[PDB]
Amino acid sequence: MKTVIQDTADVYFKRKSDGKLVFTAEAQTASFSQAISEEKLRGGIGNKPLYILKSEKEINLTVKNAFFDLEWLAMTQGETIQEETKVKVFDREHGLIVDDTNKVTLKGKPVSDVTFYNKKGLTYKIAVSTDGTYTIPTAFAAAKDKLTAVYQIEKVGRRLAIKASKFSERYEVEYRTIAYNPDTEEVYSDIYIQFPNVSPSGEFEMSLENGNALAPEIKFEALADTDTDEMAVVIEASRDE
Amino acid sequence: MKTVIQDTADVYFKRKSDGKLVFTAEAQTASFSQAISEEKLRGGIGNKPLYILKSEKEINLTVKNAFFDLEWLAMTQGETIQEETKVKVFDREHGLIVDDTNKVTLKGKPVSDVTFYNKKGLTYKIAVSTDGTYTIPTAFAAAKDKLTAVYQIEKVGRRLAIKASKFSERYEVEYRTIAYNPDTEEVYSDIYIQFPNVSPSGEFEMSLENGNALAPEIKFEALADTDTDEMAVVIEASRDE
Amino acid sequence: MKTVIQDTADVYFKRKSDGKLVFTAEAQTASFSQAISEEKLRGGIGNKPLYILKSEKEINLTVKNAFFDLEWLAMTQGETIQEETKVKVFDREHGLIVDDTNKVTLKGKPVSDVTFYNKKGLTYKIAVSTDGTYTIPTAFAAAKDKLTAVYQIEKVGRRLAIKASKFSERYEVEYRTIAYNPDTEEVYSDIYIQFPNVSPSGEFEMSLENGNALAPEIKFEALADTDTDEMAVVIEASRDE
Amino acid sequence: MKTVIQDTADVYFKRKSDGKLVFTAEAQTASFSQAISEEKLRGGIGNKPLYILKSEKEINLTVKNAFFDLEWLAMTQGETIQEETKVKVFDREHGLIVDDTNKVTLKGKPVSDVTFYNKKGLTYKIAVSTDGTYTIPTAFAAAKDKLTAVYQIEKVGRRLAIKASKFSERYEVEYRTIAYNPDTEEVYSDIYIQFPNVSPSGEFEMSLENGNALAPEIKFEALADTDTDEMAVVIEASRDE
Amino acid sequence: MKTVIQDTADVYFKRKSDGKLVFTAEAQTASFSQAISEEKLRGGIGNKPLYILKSEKEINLTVKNAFFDLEWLAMTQGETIQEETKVKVFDREHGLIVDDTNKVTLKGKPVSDVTFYNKKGLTYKIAVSTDGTYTIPTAFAAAKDKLTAVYQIEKVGRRLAIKASKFSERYEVEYRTIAYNPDTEEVYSDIYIQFPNVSPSGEFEMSLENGNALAPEIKFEALADTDTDEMAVVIEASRDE
Amino acid sequence: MKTVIQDTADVYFKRKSDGKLVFTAEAQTASFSQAISEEKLRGGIGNKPLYILKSEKEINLTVKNAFFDLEWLAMTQGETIQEETKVKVFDREHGLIVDDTNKVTLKGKPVSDVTFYNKKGLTYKIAVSTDGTYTIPTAFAAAKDKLTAVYQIEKVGRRLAIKASKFSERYEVEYRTIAYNPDTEEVYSDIYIQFPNVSPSGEFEMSLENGNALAPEIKFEALADTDTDEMAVVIEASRDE
Amino acid sequence: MKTVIQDTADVYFKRKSDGKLVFTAEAQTASFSQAISEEKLRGGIGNKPLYILKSEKEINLTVKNAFFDLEWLAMTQGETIQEETKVKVFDREHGLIVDDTNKVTLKGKPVSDVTFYNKKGLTYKIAVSTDGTYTIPTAFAAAKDKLTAVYQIEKVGRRLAIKASKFSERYEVEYRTIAYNPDTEEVYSDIYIQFPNVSPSGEFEMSLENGNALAPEIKFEALADTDTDEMAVVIEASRDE
Amino acid sequence: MKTVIQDTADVYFKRKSDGKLVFTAEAQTASFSQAISEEKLRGGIGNKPLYILKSEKEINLTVKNAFFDLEWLAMTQGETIQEETKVKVFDREHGLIVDDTNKVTLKGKPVSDVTFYNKKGLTYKIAVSTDGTYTIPTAFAAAKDKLTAVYQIEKVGRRLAIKASKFSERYEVEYRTIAYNPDTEEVYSDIYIQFPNVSPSGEFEMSLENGNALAPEIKFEALADTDTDEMAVVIEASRDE
């Protein structure tokens, strides 16, 4: 019976090392693609084909969500997130007014060497002062001027490390979607697609566009189950259960 | 006479072994492509080619429909759709309330472990309780909290299997489209593009995106016929004869 | 908890030799991408164990701004910016009128020879005259006609030479962005991406087309740190801690 | 400082062979690109990237004007335009009336074979007639019908021949543009880019579309100077000096 | 000399196909608004305009009448008015009182079913009431209540179908205006804005607004006649004849 | 100083080719506009507005008089008034009474087919009767009725043609107005707005409405001067000097 | 608390360099509007909209006065008033009684060609001389008849200059309005609206009609400040307490 | 049944982040609008026939008050109001009489600069004088005259900052209104409209006309709830309960 599919799929992930379950109900794209190649045998005067050898197969999976979480990034690297880490980040203060004594006051807690910029693009590089007041040369900026400061601070958070010697883990995936009857407009069937023995391929892109959304990508490549030689199964149920 | 084409084509199939005329008249795209490659032999002082050798042709077919059928994906593979098979799928139930005596009531019928998710993110693996209720611990959710449950259940339906198997059966594809007269507007002729020996290959792509129009995509490669040494025939049949 | 990221990160560049700080709070695009090398351990029935061989990791960075700064040009070609340098540039004059005695007046200060063009299109090349008035041949121009003049003048300003010597130095790069709470659209956390050992790369396209802004684009590419074996660090710092 | 560029550039070409200078004040695209061959050194466990190998620094130039001028595309192809030459061109005549004697009369001076087309799309292949009168076959058309004709004529004009020949001519190129101050909306700087020792590499591309401007394109390749190992210089001149 | 005009043009429409004439009546509004669309070509610094590529013109007409006639909708559609066509409409019979035995009669010659509405708005659909009796159930209404009845009858009259394709029958418009002497204040000239080969355009609007006249409006687009290119002609006459 | 303006008009046009100063007259409306294409450059977190890109500065002109003159239609389309051209116009006559012999006598001079309208809506199209008497068909009407006739006649007068070709005439325009001092309500300043190098464009619009004297509308477009690069000049005078 | 506003606002303008101050105390309208870009984030089964995904922001200002000040046009175009400049203007004279002996006495000081117009309306381009009376061509008019003349004079005053390439600078704007207590009707608070870093926008309409005042209109677009990221400040202060 | 509504609605706002309730009792307009968008899937051959797909709904809310309150536009831009803050405002005195010498006094506390204007219109800037006396050049104005002064002062009040990187939060809304009866005219029902999960879109327009009341306007955009899949609910009632 011909159907019409118009939604995305609910995607279920399972880890074949411990038994974790990661699910997504806000998917934006769920796709799977196939590829097959064959070889032919030829010989004799005129390399006419004499046989058709075995055809090989490969299957790829792509999943794109509409949210962001660090678990999707931890999946593609195989490295555990570390809670409560002390990191060193950058910070910037704008609109600082010098006094007639050529001194500015910093409201932050500078850690590294402080950098000062003025309205012409010149740079000053001055170490951390104890009392928060610095001395600025008269050639840099005159009294009643505007300066900006850049420095570093300590913060607390979570950490994920993208190393060069960590590609890990093997998963199992399921897709679920619905299919409609094209005559009475009612939902007719539920379609399930099962992939056992998949491996996460390293193809990552984080584009922080102007506006827009993130929509992370995750990509898998399918293998064959050892017990029963299957790579993907498609089940078309019905509303007769 | 020069004409105008502004519509898609019907994509009749027919297997050679046994007559199974597969029909589709609600197509969205039908495309045909040709490429030619060539090799040469080099020579003496000037590296000029001497004589031609090993020139080949290759014709590729692409069909994109608008509806969806499981007998359209069984053509790329070589397996068969096994009716009436009992399978295992995931299931999800949102919004379970924990009562005063730290218990939750389950409305489904699991055939595996039950995974519970709280409002920030966590896991709890418990086994099937024949009574129907489950005792959530105290450190997970206290009372008047909303939890999510994920199971595995059983269902009956059609079941395909994408294996690495032998694809043998060859088909006879034929397209049909009508052409219009630019001067006065009525049909002038019908255009047929009959491929005489085609072999399932190339690739497949199922992209489930959150809009609509799944548009299943299939490709084929046309090989030279044995008796007539043909690959594709283009026919223009006028409506005046 | 899942969040929504709709913004462009602020970028910070720091040279690892001295510590020059160049930042941008006006960026339009900031992205990084990953790549890996994949192959299969396969062959057929004999090599039934199929396994994915993963090797080699690539991390690339691209930043697109909206203003123009010459420090970005100086970064990709390691060379200090010469300042207050006398140079020679072209300058043209339009709409000059020939007098009765075939003598035109130039109000510029030429250095090289002077080239004169007429309205139909020719060229007269003459040397420099001290008083600033040049004789004109009778055939090339007539009385009360229109001419234009081109020469070279002297100007001062900055300079930066592109030599056939590859750049040097390595940069620490930081991206900073923010994430939003889904259910109640308030700011939840700040996300930092850090690259500790990253080299620039030469991929420039400085296209100046009419009616469009410049939007410079710079490309970096990452190498492993020699101690921690890292290439990038992703930090998610909550705003309530 | 951080300037804004929102306009194209005026270009200047000077030939180093004799003396010539050609400029543009109407260009539509001025582009300058750099390409460098980069490979990686791979090491121990995980095939980590450690060092980058750079070579082959090349610079290319792209100029697209708004007018069509035969002297400008003669730079990218080394030849000379032979003015005032006779040549053979194609000609087409429409709307011919045939009398009752199956006779047709042409106007013009054909030099080659005459081809006739009817209203259905058939071809007639009559040779040249001395008095410009032809006798169409009865089956081709009847009285009070309409036919069109194709033949060849001779014309006088210019002529440029594209061959396989070495040009070996050198130029000096200069680009000039203006740059505004973002917080005062006044012109702040003039930006010059200088290329000595350029050569006209041949990558011509000409596309004529349906109702669209042509914008001819010419490409150049910049080579290193043999006196100060420079390939391009960048100059920023402030109007306050 | 300085004609004053203070009236509305008396309009006449004529058709090419057969030549019937309409609008022997009084109008309210007439216009012939004219427009030109231009395309630019820009280049150089500042995007100065160089040359144009438009060569286009258009003329539009709008006529508004204070009366109603079915032919004014026949010119906005590609169809003819069919006459003596029996058609089905809706009638009504308001006012019914439920008695003890529920026996009330309807007058007329109904064809379709009758619907009855009470205070609670219950439908209680019944078939054709062949006699003048129909029952009422208790939950519908009590004794001595008020009901309203609706049904469908047949009528004979003129008809005008509206289809979704095809338009023909170019028209000729003449704005018969009258000019008055500025001094005498009596007819000085007779303005005859004639317009050959106009085409109807479908921008119809029909709204009824509680007692005000409908005042239908018709729109036209004027084209060059065949060869003379006289899309609009303005004629001034005199009373001196 | 601040002044109050209540009057208008005093508009002068002067031709550039020949000296023709037109309508030293009192008008109704005389406007003056300005348009600039502005686009916004955005970047950073939140896509903040930070610069405005401005170009394509244009100025238009609008004049509306109080009388209708064909000398003012000639400044929009370049086409000379073809004076004394015989033209074909329409004419209707009312109050025709049917006699007892089915005869209708026309006192006019018909030159085309005549159309008769009855009291109900029957249209009778008949050819020109040279005897001055018309035969009345029996089915058209009965005796002692009122009939209307419509036919074509010829007349003599002026004629202007609207084409779609060329406009190459230039003018200089000046506006004069009066401004009063607010504290005295006496005449203080004369304001002159002068536009050099104007060009007529076609944007005509005249609506003939009932009971309303029209205002013919004429539009122009100002263009940049060749030597002064000025579009409009605003001049304020003083009555005390 | 709750206030009632029924008045306009006093408007103050200040230039951000050489802070020229222009204020108005007789205004008619002071408004400002805000706009943002909206979208939707969707996903999952169905297309349920998840969140809003807000975007770029815009603020526009409009001021409408009741007097005429030349400085408003001088801030629409980034130019300066040039005081005490001598220019040429037009002049007209009616009521010229034609004196006998072919003389007409003048009363002004013509500087250019004098043009004469007769009763029926015709031209006559004479030239210039100290002829209190010129010499009439009896061909034109007769003695004791009417004549009108038009010529030019010289007058000194202020002037502006609208150039083809001019900016609009940047400004700070302030609106002041009063608020009322709704229970007792006494002035409670003063509301200030401060717009820093705004730019004038050129869309100027200046229509002069028959007794309609002039009512100027000026428009601004607001851009964010670099230091505080502020686009508008709304203060309720100056409360009489 | 059929009810007549002649009243406005009372509005309640509820912030789902801190538990803040905002209540309106003096409203003028409460509007609620709804739109449905549907796209259709099309097949091939001949025409492109149809199939109806799933549709989407959008709901908008609009509220208008009668009193001005700073909390209303504090929700469009989510940002708190800081109390008792120092601000700089403009001020001016009129009617200053110059002294006998040539000096004037000011009974205020200027901050930045004083810009004197005279009765004819001019400008004389001078820095702040500590003695409270200012000297004017005699050419600017003379003694026994009147001048005006404009400057800045400092004040203390409440303050709202409209920033370019801050949007609103999530809210819940309810409208209440009263219906009538068309026969007994007493009262029939209370109509409630409830909107969960709304978001205030920024479509802001506050204008200050002369002698016209100010009514602030607020807009919203409905989003479906995460539990009931609902956008807005309409609740009827009755007075008989």
mmCIF file of C-alpha atoms in Angstrom, chain G residues 5-192:
data_model
loop_
_atom_site.group_PDB
_atom_site.id
_atom_site.type_symbol
_atom_site.label_atom_id
_atom_site.label_comp_id
_atom_site.label_asym_id
_atom_site.label_seq_id
_atom_site.Cartn_x
_atom_site.Cartn_y
_atom_site.Cartn_z
ATOM 1 C CA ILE G 5 0.497 61.659 28.430
ATOM 2 C CA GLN G 6 -1.216 64.115 26.080
ATOM 3 C CA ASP G 7 1.559 66.473 24.897
ATOM 4 C CA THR G 8 4.283 66.517 22.257
ATOM 5 C CA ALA G 9 8.019 66.615 22.979
ATOM 6 C CA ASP G 10 10.749 69.234 22.872
ATOM 7 C CA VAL G 11 13.537 67.996 20.613
ATOM 8 C CA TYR G 12 17.271 68.671 20.950
ATOM 9 C CA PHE G 13 19.959 67.771 18.400
ATOM 10 C CA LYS G 14 23.713 67.741 18.968
ATOM 11 C CA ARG G 15 26.543 66.854 16.597
ATOM 12 C CA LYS G 16 29.098 64.401 17.977
ATOM 13 C CA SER G 17 32.052 66.565 16.873
ATOM 14 C CA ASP G 18 32.135 70.358 17.137
ATOM 15 C CA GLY G 19 28.872 70.004 18.994
ATOM 16 C CA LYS G 20 26.566 72.326 17.098
ATOM 17 C CA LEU G 21 23.244 72.506 18.951
ATOM 18 C CA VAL G 22 19.937 72.905 17.110
ATOM 19 C CA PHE G 23 16.707 72.761 19.102
ATOM 20 C CA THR G 24 13.017 73.192 18.367
ATOM 21 C CA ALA G 25 10.315 74.221 20.826
ATOM 22 C CA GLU G 26 7.342 74.277 18.400
ATOM 23 C CA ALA G 27 6.853 70.674 17.279
ATOM 24 C CA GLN G 28 3.906 68.645 16.045
ATOM 25 C CA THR G 29 5.067 65.024 16.157
ATOM 26 C CA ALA G 30 7.921 63.090 17.769
ATOM 27 C CA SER G 31 7.847 59.318 17.311
ATOM 28 C CA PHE G 32 10.159 56.326 17.323
ATOM 29 C CA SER G 33 9.578 52.709 16.347
ATOM 30 C CA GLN G 34 11.314 49.398 17.040
ATOM 31 C CA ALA G 35 11.464 46.267 14.892
ATOM 32 C CA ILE G 36 12.981 42.797 15.291
ATOM 33 C CA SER G 37 13.312 39.716 13.097
ATOM 34 C CA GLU G 38 11.296 36.642 14.066
ATOM 35 C CA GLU G 39 11.483 32.989 13.047
ATOM 36 C CA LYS G 40 10.616 29.563 14.450
ATOM 37 C CA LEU G 41 12.547 26.480 15.559
ATOM 38 C CA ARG G 42 10.755 23.241 14.685
ATOM 39 C CA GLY G 43 11.411 19.525 14.859
ATOM 40 C CA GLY G 44 10.264 16.120 15.976
ATOM 41 C CA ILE G 45 7.234 14.136 14.925
ATOM 42 C CA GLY G 46 5.007 16.668 13.270
ATOM 43 C CA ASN G 47 6.341 20.203 13.042
ATOM 44 C CA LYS G 48 5.566 21.552 16.492
ATOM 45 C CA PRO G 49 7.163 25.010 16.916
ATOM 46 C CA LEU G 50 9.646 24.850 19.782
ATOM 47 C CA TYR G 51 11.043 28.370 20.301
ATOM 48 C CA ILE G 52 11.167 31.871 18.847
ATOM 49 C CA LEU G 53 14.790 32.569 17.799
ATOM 50 C CA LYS G 54 14.791 36.361 17.897
ATOM 51 C CA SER G 55 17.219 38.366 15.792
ATOM 52 C CA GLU G 56 18.435 41.784 14.601
ATOM 53 C CA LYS G 57 16.928 44.963 16.054
ATOM 54 C CA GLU G 58 16.101 48.348 14.531
ATOM 55 C CA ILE G 59 15.054 51.752 15.882
ATOM 56 C CA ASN G 60 13.797 54.615 13.705
ATOM 57 C CA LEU G 61 12.941 58.202 14.662
ATOM 58 C CA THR G 62 10.576 60.706 13.032
ATOM 59 C CA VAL G 63 10.204 64.408 13.868
ATOM 60 C CA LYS G 64 7.533 66.689 12.380
ATOM 61 C CA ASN G 65 7.720 70.435 12.988
ATOM 62 C CA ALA G 66 5.504 73.445 12.292
ATOM 63 C CA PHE G 67 8.067 76.065 11.185
ATOM 64 C CA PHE G 68 10.713 76.107 8.448
ATOM 65 C CA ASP G 69 14.408 76.140 9.350
ATOM 66 C CA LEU G 70 17.119 75.782 6.723
ATOM 67 C CA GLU G 71 19.300 73.844 9.182
ATOM 68 C CA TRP G 72 17.132 70.733 8.833
ATOM 69 C CA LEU G 73 18.039 70.422 5.157
ATOM 70 C CA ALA G 74 21.599 71.202 6.263
ATOM 71 C CA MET G 75 21.641 68.122 8.493
ATOM 72 C CA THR G 76 19.834 65.911 5.983
ATOM 73 C CA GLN G 77 22.791 66.666 3.686
ATOM 74 C CA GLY G 78 26.136 66.837 5.454
ATOM 75 C CA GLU G 79 26.927 70.358 4.268
ATOM 76 C CA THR G 80 27.380 73.861 5.666
ATOM 77 C CA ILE G 81 25.425 77.060 5.105
ATOM 78 C CA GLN G 82 27.315 79.548 2.927
ATOM 79 C CA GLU G 83 26.184 83.021 3.968
ATOM 80 C CA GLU G 84 26.310 86.212 1.888
ATOM 81 C CA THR G 85 26.392 84.704 -1.602
ATOM 82 C CA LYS G 86 25.180 86.472 -4.746
ATOM 83 C CA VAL G 87 23.014 84.524 -7.198
ATOM 84 C CA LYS G 88 20.650 85.053 -10.126
ATOM 85 C CA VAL G 89 16.873 84.683 -9.801
ATOM 86 C CA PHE G 90 13.811 85.144 -12.011
ATOM 87 C CA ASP G 91 11.304 87.998 -12.149
ATOM 88 C CA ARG G 92 7.984 88.699 -13.862
ATOM 89 C CA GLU G 93 5.947 91.817 -14.611
ATOM 90 C CA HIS G 94 2.354 92.264 -15.790
ATOM 91 C CA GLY G 95 0.296 95.394 -16.349
ATOM 92 C CA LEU G 96 2.577 96.850 -19.035
ATOM 93 C CA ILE G 97 0.591 99.398 -21.033
ATOM 94 C CA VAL G 98 2.120 99.693 -24.496
ATOM 95 C CA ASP G 99 3.236 103.295 -24.920
ATOM 96 C CA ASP G 100 2.895 105.023 -28.275
ATOM 97 C CA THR G 101 5.673 105.412 -30.863
ATOM 98 C CA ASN G 102 6.549 101.721 -30.457
ATOM 99 C CA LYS G 103 7.854 102.006 -26.880
ATOM 100 C CA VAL G 104 7.252 100.081 -23.646
ATOM 101 C CA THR G 105 8.696 101.469 -20.410
ATOM 102 C CA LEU G 106 10.440 99.067 -18.027
ATOM 103 C CA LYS G 107 10.860 99.288 -14.262
ATOM 104 C CA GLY G 108 13.547 96.795 -13.185
ATOM 105 C CA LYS G 109 17.165 95.837 -13.831
ATOM 106 C CA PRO G 110 17.286 92.977 -16.359
ATOM 107 C CA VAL G 111 20.546 91.028 -16.395
ATOM 108 C CA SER G 112 19.796 88.345 -19.023
ATOM 109 C CA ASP G 113 17.613 87.944 -22.104
ATOM 110 C CA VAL G 114 14.220 89.602 -21.653
ATOM 111 C CA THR G 115 11.232 87.594 -22.882
ATOM 112 C CA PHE G 116 7.879 89.161 -23.754
ATOM 113 C CA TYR G 117 4.388 87.636 -23.926
ATOM 114 C CA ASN G 118 1.302 89.104 -25.608
ATOM 115 C CA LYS G 119 -2.448 88.688 -25.076
ATOM 116 C CA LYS G 120 -3.130 85.538 -27.108
ATOM 117 C CA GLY G 121 0.178 84.145 -25.845
ATOM 118 C CA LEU G 122 3.314 84.132 -27.999
ATOM 119 C CA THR G 123 7.075 84.733 -27.325
ATOM 120 C CA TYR G 124 9.618 87.326 -28.615
ATOM 121 C CA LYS G 125 13.206 86.934 -27.398
ATOM 122 C CA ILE G 126 14.771 90.425 -27.481
ATOM 123 C CA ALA G 127 18.232 91.135 -25.946
ATOM 124 C CA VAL G 128 19.601 93.737 -23.424
ATOM 125 C CA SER G 129 20.262 97.563 -23.317
ATOM 126 C CA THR G 130 19.676 100.749 -21.241
ATOM 127 C CA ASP G 131 16.295 101.131 -22.938
ATOM 128 C CA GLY G 132 13.861 102.247 -20.238
ATOM 129 C CA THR G 133 11.614 101.541 -23.189
ATOM 130 C CA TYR G 134 12.413 98.712 -25.562
ATOM 131 C CA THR G 135 11.034 98.701 -29.190
ATOM 132 C CA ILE G 136 7.876 96.633 -29.874
ATOM 133 C CA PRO G 137 7.460 94.681 -33.159
ATOM 134 C CA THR G 138 4.021 95.895 -34.276
ATOM 135 C CA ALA G 139 4.028 92.413 -35.696
ATOM 136 C CA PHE G 140 3.334 91.338 -32.065
ATOM 137 C CA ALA G 141 1.167 93.924 -30.392
ATOM 138 C CA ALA G 142 -0.269 97.437 -30.842
ATOM 139 C CA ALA G 143 -0.244 100.680 -28.861
ATOM 140 C CA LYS G 144 -2.535 101.055 -25.840
ATOM 141 C CA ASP G 145 -2.528 97.268 -25.459
ATOM 142 C CA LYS G 146 -1.250 94.721 -22.939
ATOM 143 C CA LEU G 147 2.134 93.059 -22.513
ATOM 144 C CA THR G 148 3.999 91.018 -19.926
ATOM 145 C CA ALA G 149 7.725 90.554 -19.436
ATOM 146 C CA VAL G 150 10.012 88.067 -17.714
ATOM 147 C CA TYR G 151 13.735 88.358 -17.016
ATOM 148 C CA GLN G 152 16.425 87.816 -14.367
ATOM 149 C CA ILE G 153 17.886 89.812 -11.478
ATOM 150 C CA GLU G 154 20.740 89.392 -9.006
ATOM 151 C CA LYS G 155 20.135 88.912 -5.282
ATOM 152 C CA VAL G 156 22.340 88.117 -2.289
ATOM 153 C CA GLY G 157 21.513 85.695 0.495
ATOM 154 C CA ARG G 158 22.166 82.289 2.008
ATOM 155 C CA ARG G 159 22.580 79.118 -0.032
ATOM 156 C CA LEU G 160 22.935 75.353 0.354
ATOM 157 C CA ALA G 161 24.385 72.698 -1.944
ATOM 158 C CA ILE G 162 22.930 69.234 -2.541
ATOM 159 C CA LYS G 163 25.805 67.158 -3.910
ATOM 160 C CA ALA G 164 25.758 63.721 -5.504
ATOM 161 C CA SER G 165 28.187 62.246 -2.928
ATOM 162 C CA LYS G 166 27.508 63.523 0.591
ATOM 163 C CA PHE G 167 27.123 61.866 3.981
ATOM 164 C CA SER G 168 24.857 62.808 6.891
ATOM 165 C CA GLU G 169 27.219 62.694 9.920
ATOM 166 C CA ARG G 170 26.131 61.402 13.341
ATOM 167 C CA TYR G 171 24.018 62.976 16.062
ATOM 168 C CA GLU G 172 22.626 62.723 19.580
ATOM 169 C CA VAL G 173 18.896 63.390 19.953
ATOM 170 C CA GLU G 174 16.791 64.074 23.046
ATOM 171 C CA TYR G 175 13.008 64.141 23.477
ATOM 172 C CA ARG G 176 11.355 65.755 26.502
ATOM 173 C CA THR G 177 7.704 65.338 27.494
ATOM 174 C CA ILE G 178 5.536 65.763 30.582
ATOM 175 C CA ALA G 179 3.282 63.321 32.428
ATOM 176 C CA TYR G 180 0.225 63.794 34.617
ATOM 177 C CA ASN G 181 -1.346 62.307 37.726
ATOM 178 C CA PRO G 182 -4.643 60.693 36.651
ATOM 179 C CA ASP G 183 -6.421 61.302 39.971
ATOM 180 C CA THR G 184 -5.760 65.032 40.440
ATOM 181 C CA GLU G 185 -4.318 66.430 37.160
ATOM 182 C CA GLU G 186 -1.060 67.940 38.353
ATOM 183 C CA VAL G 187 2.326 67.494 36.714
ATOM 184 C CA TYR G 188 4.104 64.498 38.244
ATOM 185 C CA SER G 189 7.166 63.530 36.202
ATOM 186 C CA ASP G 190 9.196 64.468 33.138
ATOM 187 C CA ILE G 191 10.073 61.777 30.596
ATOM 188 C CA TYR G 192 13.370 61.983 28.706
#
